[PDB]
């Protein structure tokens, strides 16, 4: 699921699945 | 940033993990 173009909700979903209990930051600017 | 690396171009696990806390 990670080795592709990921935009918008699709990118946030990948971050969520990869990072698990760590969480993540989404900084599109 | 992440949009240029993962949306405009092909993402990777390596790069996604740079945005985990």
Author numbering:
A (entry chain BBB): 1 to 29
B (entry chain AAA): 1 to 21
The authors write:
ID23-2 is a fixed-energy (14.2 keV) microfocus beamline at the European Synchrotron Radiation Facility (ESRF) dedicated to macromolecular crystallography. The optics and sample environment have recently been redesigned and rebuilt to take full advantage of the upgrade of the ESRF to the fourth generation Extremely Brilliant Source (ESRF-EBS). The upgraded beamline now makes use of two sets of compound refractive lenses and multilayer mirrors to obtain a highly intense (>1013 photons s−1) focused microbeam (minimum size 1.5 µm × 3 µm full width at half-maximum). The high flux density of ID23-2 makes analysis of microcrystals the most common use for the beamline.
However, the microbeam is also routinely used to attain higher multiplicity datasets from larger single crystals. This is typically achieved by collecting datasets from multiple positions on a crystal, or by using helical data collections. In this example, a large (300 µm × 50 µm × 50 µm) cubic insulin crystal was used to collect 3600 frames helically with heavy attenuation, yielding a flux of 1 × 1011 photons s−1 at an oscillation step of 0.1° with 30 ms exposures, in 7/8 multibunch mode with 200 mA ring current. SHELXC/D/E and CRANK2 were used for phasing and density improvement, followed by cycles of manual building in Coot and refinement in REFMAC5. Calculation of a model phased anomalous difference map in ANODE revealed peak heights of S positions of 14.9, 14.9, 12.9, 12.9, 12.7 and 12.6 for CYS 19B, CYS 20A, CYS 7A, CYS11A, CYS 7B and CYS 6A, respectively. Experimental electron density is shown in Fig. 6.
